[PDB]
Symmetry: C4
Subunit: 83 residues, 4 copies
């Protein structure tokens, strides 16, 4: 799979995660984007997390949609700037 | 190994983690499921975590049983929807 | 590398992490073991973490010594029980 | 890619992360270094995290620059001391 295609998939994940957290959990756009990166990179500081049952379900789908996508994107990025 | 078989292994992990946290730690079903995903994806927000020695031991076994299973499942899912 | 050898390396990491956290940070044996697994699996709930400069340095060495070791062990375990 | 080159890339990431957190977030040098390792190893205890919009953006770039770099370095280190 082309790295740029994976990059586009990661951007879609970011939009989905950001907009979802902002609207379900009510956090600002900036915090929501930050939470999304922290979640799909599997850092998970826990300074922000879902507090509603819907937010919890949404976080689970984000985790499933976002973690593999993100990992492959960083590794393809690695290859690109180094090799 | 067939991806669907791995999927079944991940579902068993989810049941084990969810039921275990609910009964050992006393959290709701919804929170327990959310905690299980957050744990085996290695996100670990720490909004929920075990507070008993048994919960701690159980979390260690879940970690060992669940993390590799989950990682292989997301990567097989990746291959499937993209390739 | 033989999986059992990797298993032995992971056990040494666990002893090192557990004893180190217990003595540097002053937490119980049980909590220290739990913290060690949570750290080297990269879950990191943050219910426990080092509070001293030495604990912080020690956690960094544990991270470096433990994360790769643990990841290879779970993946070799995966191969073993499934294949 | 030579492991030592990757090691140098990881050292640059550590400097960037440490100095960035110290100056953007105002934490000590020691805490900033500890936070950097905890972040790029994807442990993320959340005992420390950015509290400003700039700190949040910076953490996102660190995550992107640091996570793949760190993972490849630990795995190359693994090969080296074991094989
Ligand atoms: K992680
Ligand atoms: K990880
Ligand atoms: K975490
Ligand atoms: K984590
Ligand atoms: K955390």
């Amino acid at each position: 799979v082309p790295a740029t295609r994976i990059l586009l998939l990661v951007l879609a994940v970011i939009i989905y995660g950001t907009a979802g957290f902002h609207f379900i959990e009510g956090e600002s756009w900036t915090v929501s984007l930050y939470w999304t990166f922290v979640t799909i990179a599997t850092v998970g500081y826990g300074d922000y997390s879902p507090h509603t049952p819907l937010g919890m379900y949404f976080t689970c789908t984000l985790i499933v949609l976002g973690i593999g996508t993100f990992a492959v994107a960083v590794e393809r990025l690695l290859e690109f700037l180094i090799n």
